[PDB]
Nucleic acid binder design. Structure first.
Ligand code: MG
Ligand code: MG
Lengths: 96, 107
DNA sequence: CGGAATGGAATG
DNA sequence: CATTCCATTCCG
């Protein structure tokens, strides 16, 4: 029972067709968004029902992702990892 | 009109006589005081907002354009009271309709 | 104080 | 569960 957000994110990051704007970091334990504006206008509304970077980022925080602090946005969750989709089962949406 | 909750809450809080020992209008009615930060933060803030941090309250004040009123110290017996004064020109005693003019800065 | 990261909870 | 608004927290 893995939420759509996570399997879509995983597919989106992993897809080579989108790697110019969103791709795995070299060590495969975090991912990069490039050219936010382009990414928000062109990519997000193909996967989700919006075109707002801020809405995407909220979801990331809700699922426990943390920003990696350095137009290049990097995010990270330890059980969100290249080549290991089975680990998405351990990522939980934060309740209250 | 479409006034944010922060501002109507702040206005009501400052104006309420029940809270005047910790937060009240200045005599001229164009600024307000917070006394005893610690007690105010623990006992008052979480009844009106979703936290008990003075810093978080002050952040919202800055986001809506409020400025500190600067108290000048002098020498003395000069005992001081925990007293912070804030101010916005369209935030005034007895005149709630003016809140419409106070706008949040953009993030 | 204020930029920016993260959160609450109402609404979709 | 997702999306939005803007409030709260973190940290320089
Ligand atoms: Mg990709
Ligand atoms: Mg009062």
């Amino acid at each position: 029972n893995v939420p759509a957000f996570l399997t879509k994110l995983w597919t989106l990051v992993s897809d080579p067709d989108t790697d110019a704007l969103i791709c795995w970091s070299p060590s495969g334990n975090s991912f990069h968004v490039f050219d936010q504006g382009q990414f928000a206008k062109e990519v997000l509304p193909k996967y989700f029902k919006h075109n707002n970077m801020a809405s995407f980022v909220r979801q990331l925080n809700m699922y426990g992702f943390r920003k990696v602090v350095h137009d290049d946005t990097e995010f990270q969750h330890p059980c969100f990892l290249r080549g290991q989709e089975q680990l998405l089962e351990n990522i939980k949406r934060k309740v209250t």
